Amino acid sequence: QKLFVDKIREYRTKRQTSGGPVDAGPEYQQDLDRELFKLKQMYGKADMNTFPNFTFEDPKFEAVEKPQS
Amino acid sequence: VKQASIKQIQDAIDLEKSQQALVQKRHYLFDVQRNNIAMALEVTYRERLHRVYKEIKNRL
DSSP per position, B1-60: -HHHHHHHHHHHHHHHHHHHHHHHGGGHHHHHHHHHHHHHHHHHHHHHHHHHHHHHHHH-
CB of A49 within 8 A of CB of B56?
A: no
Least Cα distance to A58 among B16, B1, B38 occurs for: B38
Measured CA distances, A6 to A9, A11, A21, A22, A64 (Å): 5, 9, 19, 18, 86
- CA B54 to CA A45: how far, in whole Å? 15
**Structure obtained using:** cryo-EM
- CA A69 to CA A65: how far, in whole Å? 6
CB of A62 within 8 A of CB of B37?
A: yes
Chain B residues lying within 8 Å of A54, measured CB to CB:
none
Residues 6+ apart with CB under 8 A from A50: B59
Q: What is the DSSP letter of A37?
A: H
Chain B touched by A1 (CB under 8 Å): no
Q: What is the DSSP letter of A26?
A: T
Least Cα distance to B58 among A53, A47, A54 occurs for: A47
> Residues 19-48, chain A: which have Cβ within 8 Å of B?
43-44, 46
Residue to substitute from B30, B44, B46, interface A, most A β-carbons within 10 A:
B44
Q: Give CA torsion, residues B53, B56, B59, B60, to 10 deg.
A: -90
Chain B touched by A49 (CB under 8 Å): yes
Q: Enter the resolution in angstroms.
A: 3.0
Cβ contact, residue pair A62, B37, below 8 Å? yes
